[PDB]
Design a protein around this ligand. Structure first.
Ligand SMILES: Nc1nc2c(ncn2[C@@H]2O[C@H](COP(=O)(O)OP(=O)(O)O)[C@@H](O)[C@H]2O)c(=O)[nH]1
Ligand SMILES: Nc1nc2c(ncn2[C@@H]2O[C@H](COP(=O)(O)OP(=O)(O)O)[C@@H](O)[C@H]2O)c(=O)[nH]1
Lengths: 420, 60, 420
């Protein structure tokens, strides 16, 4: 079934704008959505088919207090995305309240696309955590979608924000987003501003314009995470079929990223795998262990020897994984696209469930716990107090996320066989 | 061999005798299995071929 | 055999004027009825063959308090329709009484034509429901025709009026018309002013001159509904042969309309069928289901694909029906005419028995029920009271139409095998 992407918030709208542009050039599409004359791919899932081959992405663009939604409109690609579905504070509470009054018209825009498509399998959100308007509005829309589509599943390309710690309420906003995310999201893929900023400092000298350049880094991961769906093959055809292996228990569902050619601009499979497991290639910032790992490779990989390769990785004991029950490394292979320069033909990404990401969640919980005692930034803005007089959703969020922090470390233990 | 490979395309078939019959097509085989679920879950001692030939066509 | 059209009332006279004009250009006829140098059709059923090729339509034009019948006379086509048969209130009762005094001369005008034809097949009325003079006169003439021609059939191109609800007695007038129409009309084809007005707003910007432009829309449907009869071929050659499939119960004889290219100003059959089942292409405004569906296509249509095409729509199931009947969607095909433009080389129409039309009948019954309690507009005009002192025909009509409203919903149920 076709995937509908609910890109929301200025930051989220920036990475959806680029992700669709990235698949414009990668696929046979021009800036006006017209089939390219120069042009073997499954474009049905991501791109709606118009009568005259105007393959329009099924993007839902939500603008709140818009500024960069106006810049998106003055672009050569304005015609490419024309489902004609764009509808008009820095606080999580401020975003949640604004979303509630306009919920029905934004929700009808969701319906239109659902009716238009032959079918709808998942809602992929370009969410921004502690995103000012992006968070709060995104949590609320996350709660409505599951109730309306109980059978359907929701993924989140959460750009978890770590900038070395401006938002003084950033921990409070993030704390609330996760509680909604931990129980109202089927899957989440985690990214880190600092981890990518550190990569940007590593591969390039770019430091001050970190947000503009890092957009390309988030994009390469995003296009790549879907390439096994966007191009066809004998295994991992549909989204869910792929989602199951990466998330082994509903509570434990945040995914780490990695790209072997971080410096993207021959190499044997044995090499591209080893390079990935190294930590400089990783884009995320008591024993600790992965729960299950997966990898996808797109290039002139010799497909016959991707087995002999795995046997070697297994004996070098380069990876630990989990003691409770069975898990294993999983090799997957795809076609890099033609048309675009296939320089560095072999490029590999990995998506993995790792207990280290618990540490990033605890750091915002640490900032929040410190901030909660001080009550330095309760906002006490009438919106904040009137929306939350008890201020107990933050405590409800604190116990839920602490259960998650606890559940992760329980996975490290030998007995997730007993309750976690 | 030349004539066999342009007047009967002996090779283009081998490429499409694995792509479709051995499940290598991948996508065709998952949208057929989705649309064929209600009909198949019923005992086929009572199944008629006119509804199978009709649904494969939708899938292709 | 030959069909005589009893166009009556100002509104009805407007759509008969245009329908005959539409078949003037479509057929080989000029504005003086003479054949033209530029122009294989069974012209006979719809046109009397004079001696010097003056193909005069067998139109019966009835004028009451005439205003738009004078404008019809000052036209270039005045010579085209010369059977020399035109004979001299806004209330249903006011129209019915006026018809009764002149019934014998209008009825002799019916006889004259009936004598002229070899075999008379049907009386097709360009009726206006709640048409002021058009309704009441039309109901009375509907009752006389069946008694005089018990073997013969009567169809009604009823322009059921929905303008968002000026006539304050409009529901009362309409209520009475249907009671006559349910027991004294073998077939009825329903059209809606609002449904077409909504189409006019959709295809064009025309809003204020809704009546003049919508005339063309009613015409395209009217010419089209008969094209299988007018042209040669073994395709449903006669009216009655076609009527049977669309109407499967004596009581439910109301037919819905649709046109695949509302914007008619190549396309495969698989496409023109799917487009039609969609509800924008429809021109009419608890489970609900069609009773039996039929379609006719006139253009450059391939023959081999139709079976492939018949099967494809069945798998899509865009049309959902579960009637007491075992009825199936039926494919029919005709020739587009030469001379006139061939734009939308393939272009189609559908006539179907749908239980949704019950809802439109109930809405006027709702306005009437509300109006009946208030008795706000009993007219109490001496014509209205003297003609109807008991005011019990309205109640007789209310039970008959309620039986119809009930019968329809009984059709939806699994046991219309039992009494409605
Ligand atoms: N990865 C990435 N993150 C961004 C970018 N721009 C803003 N952000 C993030 O967006 C978050 C704040 O969202 P904000 O821009 O305030 O949304 P606004 O309220 O609509 O302005 C911060 O945590 C930033 O890390 C960008 O270009 N790339
Ligand atoms: N479709 C259509 N309906 C019309 C047109 N003119 C009038 N009507 C309908 O005719 C009905 C009223 O009839 P009316 O014109 O009052 O008849 P009169 O009593 O002779 O004037 C209304 O319900 C209108 O919807 C037209 O040009 N097109």
């Amino acid at each position: 079934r076709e995937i509908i992407t609910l890109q929301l918030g200025q930051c989220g709208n920036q990475i959806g704008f680029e992700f669709w542009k990235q698949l414009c050039a990668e696929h046979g599409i021009s800036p006006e959505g017209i089939v390219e004359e120069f042009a073997t791919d499954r474009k049905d899932v991501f791109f709606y088919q118009a009568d005259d081959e105007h393959y329009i992405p099924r993007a839902v663009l939500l603008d709140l207090e818009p500024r960069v939604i106006h810049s998106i409109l003055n672009s050569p690609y304005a015609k490419l995305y024309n489902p004609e579905n764009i509808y008009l504070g820095n606080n999580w509470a401020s975003g949640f309240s604004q979303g509630e009054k306009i919920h029905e018209d934004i929700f009808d825009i969701i319906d239109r696309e659902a009716d238009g498509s032959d079918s709808l399998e998942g809602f992929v959100l370009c969410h921004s955590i502690a995103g000012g308007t992006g968070s709060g509005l995104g949590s609320y829309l996350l709660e409505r979608l599951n109730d309306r589509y109980p059978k359907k599943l929701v993924q989140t390309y959460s750009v978890f924000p770590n900038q070395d710690e401006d938002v003084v309420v950033q921990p409070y906003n993030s704390l609330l987003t996760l509680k909604r995310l931990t129980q109202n999201a089927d899957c989440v893929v985690v990214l880190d501003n600092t981890a990518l900023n550190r990569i940007a400092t590593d591969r390039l000298h770019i430091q001050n314009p970190s947000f503009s350049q890092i957009n390309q880094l988030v994009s390469t991961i995003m296009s790549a995470s879907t390439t096994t769906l966007r191009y066809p093959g004998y295994m991992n055809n549909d989204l869910i079929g792929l989602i199951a292996s990466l998330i082994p228990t509903p509570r434990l569902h945040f995914l780490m990223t990695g790209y072997t050619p971080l410096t993207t601009d021959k190499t044997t499979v044995l090499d591209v795998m080893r390079r990935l497991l190294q930590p400089k290639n990783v884009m995320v910032s008591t024993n600790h262990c992965y729960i299950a790992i997966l990898n996808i490779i797109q290039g002139e990989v010799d497909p016959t020897q991707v087995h002999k390769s795995l046997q070697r990785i297994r004996e070098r004991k380069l990876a630990n994984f989990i003691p409770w029950g069975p898990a294993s490394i999983q090799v997957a292979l795809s076609r890099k696209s033609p048309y675009l320069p296939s320089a560095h033909r072999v490029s590999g990404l990995m998506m993995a469930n790792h207990t280290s990401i618990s540490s990033l969640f605890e750091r915002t919980c640490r900032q929040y716990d410190k901030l909660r005692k001080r009550e330095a930034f309760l906002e006490q803005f009438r919106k904040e107090d009137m929306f939350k007089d008890n201020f107990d959703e933050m405590d409800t969020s604190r116990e839920i996320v602490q259960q998650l922090i606890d559940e992760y470390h329980a996975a490290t233990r030998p007995d997730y066989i007993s309750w976690g | 061999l030349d004539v066999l490979n342009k007047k009967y395309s002996l090779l283009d078939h081998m490429q499409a005798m694995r792509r479709y019959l051995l499940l290598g097509q991948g996508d065709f085989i998952r949208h057929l299995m989705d649309l064929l679920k209600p009909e198949l879950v019923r005992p086929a001692t009572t199944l008629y071929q006119h509804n199978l030939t009709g649904i494969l066509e939708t899938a292709v």
